[PDB]
A paper describes a structure:
Vibrio dual lipases/transferases (VDLTs, e.g., VPA0226 of Vibrio parahaemolyticus, lec/VC_A0218 of Vibrio cholera, and VvPlpA of Vibrio vulnificus) are a class of virulence factors secreted by Vibrio pathogens to disrupt host membrane structures. VDLTs contain an N-terminal domain (NTD) of unknown function and a C-terminal catalytic domain belonging to the SGNH/GDSL hydrolase family, which is named after the four characteristic catalytic residues (Ser, Gly, Asn, and His). Therefore, VDLTs are enzymes with unusual dual substrate and catalytic promiscuity, which could benefit pathogens in handling diverse host lipid molecules in a proper manner. Crystal structures of the VDLT from Vibrio alginolyticus (ValDLT) and its fatty acid complexes were solved, revealing prominent structural flexibility.
Numbering used by the authors: 29 to 418
Write the structure that this text describes.
Amino acid sequence: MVSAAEVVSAQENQTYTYVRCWYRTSHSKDDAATDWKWAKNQDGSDFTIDGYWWSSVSFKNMFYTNTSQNVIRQRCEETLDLANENADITFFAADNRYSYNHTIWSNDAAMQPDQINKVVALGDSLSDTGNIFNASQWRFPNPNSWFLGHFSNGFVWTEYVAKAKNLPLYNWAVGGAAGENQYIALTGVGEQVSSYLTYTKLAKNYNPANTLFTLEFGLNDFMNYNRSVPEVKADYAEALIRLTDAGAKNFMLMTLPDATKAPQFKYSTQEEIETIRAKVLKMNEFIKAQAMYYKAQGYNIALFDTHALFEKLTSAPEEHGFVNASDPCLDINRSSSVDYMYTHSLRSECAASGADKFVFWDVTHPTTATHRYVAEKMLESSNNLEEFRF
Ligand SMILES: CC/C=C\C/C=C\C/C=C\C/C=C\C/C=C\C/C=C\CCC(=O)O
């Protein structure tokens, strides 16, 4: 994807950069608003990281450093000095106030034990941690009502999984239900796989066998692009073929929840609902066949039935720690992509119960309590990832 000559030239172009530490301003997960501060050292001087920059034709610049994610995290926690359990700290590389949020890749050591040491996420808005946020010039999704480019009031399921295992998370996921395709073109799983393959050729001592891959895709295609079941099946199979041929060995796979149970479908016709629900059911049977196909070949596959979990969550939310599974927490009573540009109050029922008792944050996307509940159910069912080496 990148020539040997291009790789050394980029890696030898050594420099330094600063770290932007982001945090939730409120102690409540009902308030999505965030702010940032520059990372500092305990003596009060600016915290810098050494390394090199690289971007493909896409021009999403990634900073590659030898400094670990744990060290950078610790610097942010110490700089911010918040006694907020909901601070939900995230960090990025940035030369100054004009710079956007660049992901920092912590390069592995040549001496690497045979165990997972990072999570790589592919998919849609159910996994996106901010890939549309820089392109939108930090205006979409509106950072007062959506948590720093996450289509939720906080962390998504991949972030809870990565945190539970104390691993860094590198995100290639990006959705379409919110009109994301008006800000970045190349959002298909195929383009995400190509991007991942391109950026990891610039990483040092990269062993794909030590990556835990998460993949969830198909709802964007069925809901927003009216794609046929065979073409989504073919893309899903192609992503796994491409990844396994590129040394991937560890996967967290999942069935698609019935998206028609989301609040936005209150405004859809029954014919539209029945078409989407039926496509989800055939895709789920193919996802199970694919998980079994790779499992039979000796790959480490964890398959979670999110569909069956979601059916239980919506039929009896009271049994799963929720009061409402039908309505958004935000006071959004239509399905209009322009609503992602504005600040919204919480509807009375959600203001009263708190966002952690609502399944949905907006008309499409689940709350961070739902994301954590899924992440915890995934970790339990796979016995804190029993077939994976940590
Ligand atoms: C594939 C699901 C696996 C993990 C994601 C974690 C939690 C999801 C939990 C419950 C289901 C919630 C909502 C279903 C409704 C809509 C999905 C939303 C967006 C997908 C399409 C897009 O981003 O364009």
